[PDB]
Amino acid sequence: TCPFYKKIPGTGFTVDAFQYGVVEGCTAYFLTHFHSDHYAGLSKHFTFPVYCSEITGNLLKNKLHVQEQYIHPLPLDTECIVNGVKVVLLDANHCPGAVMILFYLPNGTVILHTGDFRADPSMERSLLADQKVHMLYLDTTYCSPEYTFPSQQEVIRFAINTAFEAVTLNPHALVVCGTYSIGKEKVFLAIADVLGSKVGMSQEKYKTLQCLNIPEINSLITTDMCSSLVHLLPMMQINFKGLQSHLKKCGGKYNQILAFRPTGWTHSNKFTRIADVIPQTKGNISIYGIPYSEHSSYLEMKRFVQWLKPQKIIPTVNVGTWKSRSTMEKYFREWKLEAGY
Ligand SMILES: C=CCNC(=O)c1nc(N[C@@H](C)C(=O)NO)c2ccccc2n1
Ligand SMILES: [Zn+2]
Ligand SMILES: [Zn+2]
């Protein structure tokens, strides 16, 4: 059934709860962002109100074919009333259209649901600065101190420099970026921009990017593969076998592939700083795993929570084992004692 951390107490609201059938007493279903583990269950047959960002709403309409009458997009940073409850959507710094939701409950309690987020100091200057938060539903994906990775900007700097050098040294090299969902678009957009090329992709991926309100997107992306020297492929094809096969389809136009696998955190990232990252190479194909994260590092998560000073924290990730739940509560306790709330 629907887990407790997906229900907002004192309301008829659920968050990211689309795979449990009709949730008893739910009058509005919130969707934090368009990632399959969150929209799972939504389809053209859904007949309840869905509240979300404009971008998420574009994807619901065009990709899942949810009926327009059930899509309720809300602007960011704006007090809105939904079923008699004041709510605000805030940028989650996750993927395009991803939001955190602030609920102002009728009894005076204030709840922040982060959805998925990458905590950032800029969030300390949103509407969050203005009032106390009694409950925090926290994206705890990387809630352990071993989860370190660089900033997104540092990872992009590495990717741009690596691609620019390779193509400047060999104008016949092809750059390939793997993708499986929305998010992490900056990897391929920044590489294509430095190389003066558009990004070539399948019709399905092109359709998805057309829903993202990305400025000047028609100048950046294309389905014309051969006119482009940065190609997007499904993540599962970013291996030597899949890349060798892709190189044949190009028709003697390229003699080298440099490929990027933007992963999340990897244990290798503790040893090797972003500047020391080296690829796996087989012949004329090199594959760079790069730690581009759209979730908070441990340090980013700790800073955000210690600033927010919530009275109670409900984790939404890694909640499956006694060990994982215990470890997270121990960190919350440490953060609270250190900061004094
Ligand atoms: C290792 C931690 C990172 N996060 C997940 O474990 C995760 N991420 C997903 N997609 C990403 C894009 C996302 O951010 N979604 O919200 C999944 C999609 C389908 C099934 C399981 C999924 N697990
Ligand atoms: Zn996500
Ligand atoms: Zn997720």
Residue numbers in the entry: 700 to 1040
What does the literature reporting this entry say, word for word?
Three human ‘MBL-fold’ DNA repair factors, SNM1A, SNM1B (Apollo) and SNM1C (Artemis) are involved in repair of ICLs and DSBs. SNM1A–C have conserved β-CASP and metallo-β-lactamase (MBL) domains. SNM1A/SNM1B are 5′–3′ exonucleases with the unusual capacity to hydrolyse DNA substrates containing lesions, including ICLs. SNM1A has a role in replication-coupled ICL repair, functioning with the endonuclease, XPF-ERCC1, to effectively “unhook” the ICL and allow downstream processing.
Interestingly introduction of an extra carbonyl group at position 2′ (as in amide 20), resulted in a 100-fold decrease in potency when compared to 13, while against SNM1B and SNM1C inhibitors 13 and 20 show inhibition with a similar range. As was the case for the initial ELF hit compound soaking, crystals were back-soaked to remove malonate ions with or without 500 μM ZnCl2 to obtain the mono- and di-metal forms suitable for soaking different classes of inhibitors. We obtained structures for SNM1A complexed with three derivatives of 6 (13, 20, and 19) at resolutions ranging from 1.5 to 1.8 Å. All of these compounds bind to SNM1A with very similar orientations. Their quinazoline ring is positioned to stack with D736, in an equivalent position to the adenine moiety in the SNM1B nucleotide complex. The hydroxamate group binds to both metal ions with its carbonyl oxygen coordinating with M1 and with its hydroxyl group bridging M1 and M2, the latter likely in a manner similar to the nucleophilic water. A hydrogen bond is formed between one of the carboxylate oxygens and D736 and the nitrogen of the hydroxamate moiety with all three compounds. The R1 methyl group of the inhibitors is directed towards the side chains of H734 and S880. The binding modes of the R2 substituents are more diverse, but all of them occupy a similar position close to K883, Y841 and G963. These three residues form the binding pocket of the 5′ phosphate of the substrate, which has been shown to be a key determinant of DNA binding and exonuclease activity for SNM1B.26 With all three inhibitors, the R2 groups are positioned in an equivalent position to the ribose ring of the nucleotide in the SNM1B nucleotide complex, but do not extend into the phosphate binding pocket itself.
